[PDB]
Amino acid sequence: SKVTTVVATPGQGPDRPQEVSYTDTKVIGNGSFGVVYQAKLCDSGELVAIKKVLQDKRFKNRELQIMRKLDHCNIVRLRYFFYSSGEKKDEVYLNLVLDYVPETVYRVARHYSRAKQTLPVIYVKLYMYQLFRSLAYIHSFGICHRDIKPQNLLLDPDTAVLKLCDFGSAKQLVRGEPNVSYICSRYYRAPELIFGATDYTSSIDVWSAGCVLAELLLGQPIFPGDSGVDQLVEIIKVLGTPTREQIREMNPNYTEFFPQIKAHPWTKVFRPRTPPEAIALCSRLLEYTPTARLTPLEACAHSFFDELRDPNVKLPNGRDTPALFNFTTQELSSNPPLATILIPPHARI
């Protein structure tokens, strides 16, 4: 096949571009996020993803500025970036050279669903824990992903490493600054977004995470619906009607604007076999009041993840678990004392 050589800037560290050669370029997919290709680096044979988006002349690419700052084992790494002239004539394209990961939580979940099987809980633990770590990290910079969903959660089946991807909606959220309420995907959107709040916080990601957890436990989405109304009905069927205080916490302008349904006890929502800890974690993620939701880091410390902190835990394929405890100060900054739960006695000696 073709070898392509470009001069590209390393994603992190100093602006010192280098000759990068790659080959074996296949389309992974395309959509609103642009076009994601897979390629092989000639130097190493390592597979990478290349995300190509049209670059606006009139502004800096927000996704680039965010990825150049991020360095975490559960987030796809920006290896390089470069500019090219692709499909639209005389227009300029930004190319992000990112970690390639061969699967998504979406595809893995769907295999289990179709086969009428549930994903073993060890993987629900591993995957959710790693998502929460990625969220603790990005939130410690004030950065909200704003599109947490099973498709944006990439997986290596062999190591059970999970990496968050797609930062095209990601944004630093500053108290008092308004943000667009039309972000986040169908099924994963926090109720405050459905009600059109523009003063929302990073806790929207935590709601989205809770929906992923629930879905992995149930084998299907917990709050489906083709309209906001239908999604809210599904939410209310589980959480019960929101009180006046809960509605003001979500969006002040909706005081009047619901049916009166009593809450369905959370144990009755999932299969009978479902671990009580998993359920308890859901109920502390999927809360009407944004401030009442666990933070990502507190989610990592939750009892549901105790097995992962066991010195004898192994993956079903026999391998060791991936990196789980290499917490940094940045990562821990929202609550350092949790370090004593998060880094278990045997880890990191």
Place this chain on the structure above:
Amino acid sequence: SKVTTVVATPGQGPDRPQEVSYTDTKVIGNGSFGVVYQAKLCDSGELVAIKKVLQDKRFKNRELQIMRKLDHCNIVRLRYFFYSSEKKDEVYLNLVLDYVPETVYRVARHYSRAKQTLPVIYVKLYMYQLFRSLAYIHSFGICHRDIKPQNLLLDPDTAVLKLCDFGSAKQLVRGEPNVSYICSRYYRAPELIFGATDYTSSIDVWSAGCVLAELLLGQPIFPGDSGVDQLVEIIKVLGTPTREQIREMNPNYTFKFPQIKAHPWTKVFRPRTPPEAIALCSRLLEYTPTARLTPLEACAHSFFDELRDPNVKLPNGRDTPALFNFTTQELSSNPPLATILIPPHARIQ
């Protein structure tokens, strides 16, 4: 086998209860709209639909009060309503409604799966009927708020279309705020996506436009799992909205948008799409809500000229359904459009 007899109030006219007997009850479907049954009326043998929803103690049912006022050949008629008792010690409103055997959604999907599009004569018939239904409900200030292919019922033999499901319908009074989370994915007007609460009945017209475009293309025109993704698809076709257009949709957003040039609508559809179909979409699917055609102006569009031809027939040789028996109520938003809407042959003594 089993016969159910209930005492029910007629949908229209004087409140004199009747004894209604029906059998052969089957579920059509269920969801956020409640449960919809099919049943056969014992006397006539006629099929009807019974929509059953939970009745709030605190309020009169909105959909009922709307349905009692409406009488039009392109809206499912409320025949009877009664109260009954799934959730125990609780009351259910039952609406006995015209039954129609098909939906536009199912029809469109049959043709899409066969890699074909619906013949234009049917697009014309169906859309014309949808626009009449809208001109009528809007003349009461009532906005349906969930115009989508599934809510458009079709008789496959007579080509009669009826609008159904008024569970989101509401009278929109100027200066009153309304919730922006109504209306289904794919069919939502941009002002809804931008969170406007001062929107008008013109949202229905946008939705009708998306339905038209979809019947011409064989797939939805503005798909996307998030608002962001839907806006991107809208922008690819309409071009970037100007600031004046933004202010018309929602003032509190006057974010920055990707700067994209308008895609000439002739380029959007398949090569032999009738140009008047394309002109019609372009006048429905406008950013500025007040720049969109009203339903009654859409009915008078040239795309519908063939339906006004005296010798027009369905492909199966039958006559078209009634298309010109406009009442004063229906015409009330622009009475001089009668000069186009009622063709010369329909005014012969």
Place this chain on the structure above:
Amino acid sequence: AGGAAAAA
């Protein structure tokens, strides 16, 4: 308005 009764 209502009131139910079943038969066969």
